[PDB]
Structure formats: structure tokens, C-alpha cells
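Dear colleagues,

I hope this message finds you well. In preparation for our joint manuscript, I am sending the NS1 protein (Human parvovirus B19) sequence together with its predicted structure, so that both groups work from identical material. I would be grateful if you could confirm receipt.
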Amino acid sequence: ELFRGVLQVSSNVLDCANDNWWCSLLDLDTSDWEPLTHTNRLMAIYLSSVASKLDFTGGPLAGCLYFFQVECNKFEEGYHIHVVIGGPGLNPRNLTVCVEGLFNNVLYHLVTGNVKLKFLPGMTTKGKYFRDGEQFIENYLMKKIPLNVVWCVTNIDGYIDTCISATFRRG
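The corresponding C-alpha cells are as follows:
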């Protein structure tokens, strides 16, 4: 059982990227992927940085399974990040504040000003949080090919290698 939701990264967020974001030394495995350039690369650096921070973050996020996937916004400029996450410390009450706190903590090092993302939990119109995160990964997120999917990070055993494999995602 994993929760899921979406954050937005507007173009104004990308306008505020500092040189530590742009000149990141992170080299990402694109040997089975489309090239990562311009703001697509920035987004890929951010997800990798968020993933690395989460790996070493405890409290409510300790032991959590996560699957992050960033994609372009089809009608407007910018991006959205698909967040599938669950764990023993996470629950419908602290989900938003923990996810938002994590993504904004990492983001703060990469922007010149104060810019804050909003996490919108996947839920019914009566407020029941979605718990179909695993199914959402398998039926939807993993079926996208680059650059419909821009970048992806996960710690889930089923996808550690496949998540950034264009060949896997095609078949």
C-alpha cells in the first residue's frame, strides 16, 4: 500500500535556478535514455538530489518506499512530479507536510529566492487518500517512454534498474 500525489514545478521555479543547480556535477545514467539537456536536465538533477536526501532521512520518512517520476506539463509550461510513496511512518495526516518539507528542503539549495512547491495528494472527492500507488506505477507511470517521462528515481526492488530503462518501458 503506497500513497500517491503530484507536485508542480512552474517555469518561474526554473527561472530562479542558481548556478549550483545548473553546474551540477551529477552524472546520470542515460545510456538507455534520451539526452538530458536544458531544463529537462535540471529536473533530472532535482529528482536525483531529492532521492539521495530521502535515502538518508529518518523520522516519518524512515524506511519508506518511493517512486518519483517527472514529466512535462502538456498544456502549460513547466513540469509535474509524480510521487508514489509509503512507509511505516507515513499516514494521511502527515503525508503532505512530510513530502512538501522534503521536496522544498532540497529545492531551497537550488533556487536564488524563496520558492515553494505544493504537494496535492491523490484522493477521492470525499477525501479518502489513494492507496493504489503500486498499481499506478505499473499501469501508468512505467509505460511512458522518454521524453514523455523526463526522469525517474525509485528505491522499490522491482524498478531499481528498469525505472530509467527506455527499452524496458517500451516492451
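For the figure legend, we might mention the following. The beta strands are 3-9, 65-72, 79-86, 119-121, 151-154. The longest strand covers residues 65-72.

With kind regards,
E.M.
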